[PDB]
Write a protein that binds this ligand. Structure first.
Ligand code: 780
Ligand code: CA
Length: 223
């Protein structure tokens, strides 16, 4: 997260770190046995780490569970990152409490202007690589569709939205992909891509979760 602040230990209890010897993406807990992340964060050997804050120290509250299966959206396009969503099922269920809780899926899409919280252990520099130890947060709004499309002509589909600041300075960055964008207590986005981090007029693009709720629901119901 570039230009964000330290969330404070376990203040984002639905945030998960996907680990394969190190942290490579974030994700969101939506129920006791399922996480939602981004399709390009797919790999085998994923351990989902819950109740974290410093990802390099065991501080207590952590639950480490292995993924039983990951489901990449079938129409995921790696060249356009259209449909960049993935569901990970956990081997056993997580123990929910005040430090590990899930987040509700939206019933309606959010409107431009809506302010949301984006979190993650990603890079904090736009020009360089500095990965933090504890979780970072950034409050950013959803932009209108015309600004998004005017920033990324020909690269935004209806399953994507831009959120951020056009003046630059604040944005999600690498290490944040897969993580959440929660607005009014509903998961409205997943960190998907961007051009650099915190650059001027190049806001971050997020996968539009309101467009996948029936799919998340039906897939989870059948697996
Ligand atoms: O996410 C990502 C990755 C990556 C590839 C494959 C698996 C896991 C991660 C590699 C490089 C960069 C990124 C990435 N860049 C980026 C930029 C923004 C932004 N500027 N808003 C958000 C999220 C990411 N991820
Ligand atoms: Ca830790």
């Amino acid at each position: 997260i570039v230009g964000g602040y330290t969330c404070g230990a376990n203040t984002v209890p639905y945030q998960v770190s996907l680990n394969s010897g190190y942290h490579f993406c974030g994700g969101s807990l939506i129920n006791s046995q399922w996480v939602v992340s981004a399709a390009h964060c797919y790999k085998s050997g994923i351990q989902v780490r819950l109740g974290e804050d410093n990802i390099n120290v065991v501080e207590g509250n952590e639950q480490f569970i292995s993924a039983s299966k990951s489901i990449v959206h079938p129409s995921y396009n790696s060249n356009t990152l259209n449909n960049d969503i993935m569901l990970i099922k956990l081997k056993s269920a997580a123990s929910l409490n005040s430090r590990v809780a899930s987040i509700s899926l939206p019933t309606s899409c959010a409107s431009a202007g809506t302010q949301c919280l984006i979190s993650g252990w990603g890079n904090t520099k736009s020009s360089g690589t500095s990965y933090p130890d504890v979780l970072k947060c950034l409050k950013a709004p959803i932009l209108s569709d015309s600004s998004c499309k005017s920033a990324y002509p020909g690269q935004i589909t209806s399953n994507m939205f831009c959120a951020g600041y056009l003046e630059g300075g604040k944005d999600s960055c690498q290490g944040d992909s897969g993580g959440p964008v929660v607005c009014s207590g509903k998961l409205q986005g997943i960190v998907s891509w961007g051009s650099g981090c915190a650059q001027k007029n190049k806001p971050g693009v997020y996968t539009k979760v309101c467009n996948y709720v029936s799919w998340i629901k039906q897939t989870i119901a059948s697996n």
